[PDB]
Amino acid sequence: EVLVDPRSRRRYVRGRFLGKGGFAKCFEISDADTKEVFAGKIVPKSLLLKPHQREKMSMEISIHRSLAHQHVVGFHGFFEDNDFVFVVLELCRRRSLLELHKRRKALTEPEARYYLRQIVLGCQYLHRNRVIHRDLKLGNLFLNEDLEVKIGDFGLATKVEYDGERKKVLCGTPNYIAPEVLSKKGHSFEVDVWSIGCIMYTLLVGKPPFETSCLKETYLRIKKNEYSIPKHINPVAASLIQKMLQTDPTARPTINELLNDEFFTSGYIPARLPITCLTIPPRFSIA
Numbered sequence: 632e633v634l635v636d637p638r639s640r641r642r643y644v645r646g647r648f649l650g651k652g653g654f655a656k657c658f659e660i661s662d663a664d665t666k667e668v669f670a671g672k673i674v675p676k677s678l679l680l681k682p683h684q685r686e687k688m689s690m691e692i693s694i695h696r697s698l699a700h701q702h703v704v705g706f707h708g709f710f711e712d713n714d715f716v717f718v719v720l721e722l723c724r725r726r727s728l729l730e731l732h733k734r735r736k737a738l739t740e741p742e743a744r745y746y747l748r749q750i751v752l753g754c755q756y757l758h759r760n761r762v763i764h765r766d767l768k769l770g771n772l773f774l775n776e777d778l779e780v781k782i783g784d785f786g787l788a789t790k791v792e793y794d795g796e797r798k799k800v801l802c803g804t805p806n807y808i809a810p811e812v813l814s815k816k817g818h819s820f821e822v823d824v825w826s827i828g829c830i831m832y833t834l835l836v837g838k839p840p841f842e843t844s845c846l847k848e849t850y851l852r853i854k855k856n857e858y859s860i861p862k863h864i865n866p867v868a869a870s871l872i873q874k875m876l877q878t879d880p881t882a883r884p885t886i887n888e889l890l891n892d893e894f895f896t897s898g899y900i901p902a903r904l905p906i907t908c909l910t911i912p913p914r915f916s917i918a
């Protein structure tokens with residue numbers, strides 16, 4: 632019920648349940664002194680009996696704590712007792728792109744541009760810091776009160792240690808999983824750009840690129856590149872999706888190139904979005 636840090640002498644009440652991912656149960660929490668409000672991932676040690684498991688949890692924190700950016704969920708601290716691990720993160724009051732997508736389905740182009748821009752800004756930061764998220768999806772992309780985007784859940788993230796490194800395995804299963812991970816051909820940064828492609832598609836279209844009833848049939852399509860963009864999607868968008876969803880990872884654009892695509896440069900990107908837009912499609916009228 633209460634959660635105490637020895638080293639910082641800070642105590643947090645446990646509030647409402649938000650969700651679960653991996654071994655973590657995540658709750659809204661508040662500091663007993665400042666009444667300031669946080670997001671609290673609570674991982675049971677009962678599930679970290681094995682070294683391999685313990686190291687991932689330990690890597691997650693190492694990576695997350697190394698991060699400070701406008702579009703990355705703010706890291707605030709960690710502590711433990713004998714039974715549980717406790718990680719304290721920024722609370723994103725307006726949930727995630729995933730909830731938005733289930734309420735609104737396909738968004739308008741300029742909403743997509745807005746979110747997409749922020750996502751690519753968060754990811755540019757990661758990549759310049761030699762970090763690959765490896766699991767970017769709508770459920771990961773969080774929204775603060777101003778509907779600003781915060782990348783979260785670093786539990787599949789890896790740090791690149793040397794130039795031209797090719798990671799050989801990925802422990803766990805990403806949602807928008809790159810074809811080169813599936814083919815166990817080795818992988819690096821292009822997996823995040825891959826995911827963004829799927830996310831762009833999903834925001835513009837109202838459903839994921841490669842969906843089927845069998846995950847393993849989905850995996851099949853991802854290998855064969857079997858997906859179509861409907862004809863009502865704009866061809867400047869279509870070009871981008873197509874660019875980002877390429878089997879050959881050397882062909883896909885880097886994160887730093889993406890904001891200089893016609894799709895951002897010759898299209899309208901809102902400075903901000905109103906709350907209304909959580910539920911009602913913004914027409915963007917001139918007055």
Ligand SMILES: Cc1ncc(CCCN(C)C)cc1Nc1ncc2c(n1)-c1ccc(Cl)cc1NC(=S)C2
Nearest residue numbers: 649650651652657670704722723726727770783784
């Ligand atoms: C306040 C709030 N309410 C509802 C949701 C939606 C949770 C389920 N959705 C992602 C499928 C999100 C938030 N905001 C919110 N804000 C910060 C976090 C979280 N959620 C959160 C929550 C659940 C999980 Cl499993 C991971 C997780 N990750 C991070 S880095 C901290």
Ligand SMILES: [Zn+2]
Nearest residue numbers: 683801802803
């Ligand atoms: Zn493993």
